[PDB]
């Protein structure tokens, strides 16, 4: 066995010692890890709804952290104001179990969260949760796959942690990851080819028949956001979830879905945009607001952006 275990806690603990945290973020992240480990377990045996189980699990651990004041979940109509006695300084937006639809086919589902520091001195309210993604102080997700992973983006980089099931701790596996500058994979559901705007139809076209005669990009789309975004972070490329008829503003939620993934992308060196603007700069008006997202290696989203404006004729 190893005598010096590099656990996530040790890591967030060092990090917090720089800025001089009170340690709340550590309580927050520890509580979160407990919820994630419980979910990985439910998932690894749920066969021999989980959605509500996961929501409650994450909600309860978060509250017991004494580190939060406002909880916004994909699973809740309204924002949650944490009791005064368990109150703390952070606002956390989360999607307890994402990809919960195609869950049977074992397609890598996951948990997504974004953490903001409350700014107003007054009583907590939904307003605290309506901050632009650029205001996030931490963000990440857990991918429940062959192994349970937790990717975390602090204000100093992206680090990948893998759950060691023998001791139930997330061990640092990759430190300060950077997304490659240009990738060879594009990802999106081409089954909606019929509703795609001309910009996307053109961009895709340039992928299958490159004009400089290079090898065309390969296609890859899992169907679960956390899965597609993770492959993107890891091997590079681009991920697209534009608007169509069935979802004229995109299908992915802004607060607890696009923002946390946008923040991780930038910290990783990638980019995240709506075509018009960067996801992190969008100021939210509603906690369940959606947004179109194009994200990935910088050289590919930029190439996308040119084609976007060539058609914006602004």
CB of 218 to a second copy, least distance (A): 4
235 binds, among Mg ion, a second copy, none (CB under 5 to 8 A by kind): a second copy
DSSP labels for 266-298? HHHT-EEE-SSSBGGGPPPSSTT-B--EEEE-H
Q: Does 300 bind Mg ion (CB under 5 A)?
A: no
Contacts with a second copy in 22-41 (CB under 8 A)?
22, 24
Work out whether 228 is an interface residue with Mg ion (CB under 5 A).
no
145 known ligand binder: no
Q: How far is CA 70 from the centre of its chain?
A: 19
Residue 118 sits in the site that holds a second copy (CB under 8 A): yes
Query: Does the protein bind a second copy through residue 230 (CB under 8 A)?
Result: yes
Which residues between 79 and 138 bind Mg ion (CB under 5 A)? Answer: 95, 98
Binding test (CB under 8 A) with a second copy, winner from 219, 249, 276, 281: 219
Within its chain, how far is the Cα of 244 from the centroid?
Answer: 22
Binding status of residue 109 toward a second copy by CB under 8 A: yes
- CA–CA separation, 259 vs 246, rounded Å? 22
Neighbours of 142 (CB within 10 A): 27
| 191 known ligand binder | yes
Q: Kindly state whether residue 192 participates in binding a second copy, applying the rule CB under 8 A.
A: yes
**Within 13 Å and on the Cβ side, how many CA atoms surround 175?**
7
Q: Hey, is 147 helix, strand or coil?
A: coil
Breaks (C-N over 2.5 A) in the chain follow: 48
Contact flags string 241-280 toward a second copy, x per CB under 8 A: ----------------------------------------
Q: What is the DSSP letter of 258?
A: I
Q: Which residues are annotated as a binding site?
A: 12-16, 22-26, 74, 89-90, 95, 97-101, 117, 189-192, 220-225, 241, 251-253, 257
């Amino acid at each position: 066995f190893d005598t010096d275990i590099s656990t996530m806690t040790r890591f967030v603990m060092e990090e917090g010692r720089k800025a001089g945290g009170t340690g709340e973020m550590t309580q927050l992240l520890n509580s979160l890890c407990t919820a994630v480990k419980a979910i990985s377990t439910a998932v690894r045996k749920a066969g021999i709804k989980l959605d509500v189980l996961s929501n409650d699990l994450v909600m309860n651990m978060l509250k017991s952290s004494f580190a939060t004041c406002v909880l916004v979940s994909e699973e809740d109509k309204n924002a949650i104001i944490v009791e005064p006695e368990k109150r703390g300084k952070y606002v956390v937006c989360f999607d307890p179990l994402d990809g919960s639809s195609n869950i049977d086919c074992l397609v890598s589902i996951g948990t997504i969260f974004g953490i903001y520091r409350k700014k107003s001195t007054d009583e907590p309210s939904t307003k605290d949760a309506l901050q632009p993604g650029r205001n996030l102080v931490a963000a990440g997700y857990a991918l429940y796959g062959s192994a349970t992973m937790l990717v975390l983006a602090g204000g100093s980089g992206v680090n990948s942690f893998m759950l060691d099931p023998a001791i139930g701790e997330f061990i640092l596996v990759d430190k300060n990851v950077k997304i490659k500058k240009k990738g060879n994979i594009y990802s999106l559901n081409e089954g909606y080819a019929k509703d795609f705007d001309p910009a996307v139809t053109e961009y895709i076209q340039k992928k299958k028949f490159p004009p400089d005669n290079s090898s065309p990009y390969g296609a890859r789309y899992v169907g679960s956001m956390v899965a597609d975004v993770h492959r993107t972070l890891v091997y590079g490329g681009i991920f697209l979830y534009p608007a169509n008829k069935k979802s004229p503003d995109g299908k992915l939620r802004l607060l607890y879905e696009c923002n946390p993934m946008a923040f991780i992308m930038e910290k990783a060196g990638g980019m995240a945009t709506t075509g018009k603007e960067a996801i992190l700069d969008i100021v939210p008006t509603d906690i369940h607001q959606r947004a179109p997202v194009i994200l990935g290696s910088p050289d590919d989203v930029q190439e996308f952006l040119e084609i976007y404006k060539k058609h914006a004729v602004k």
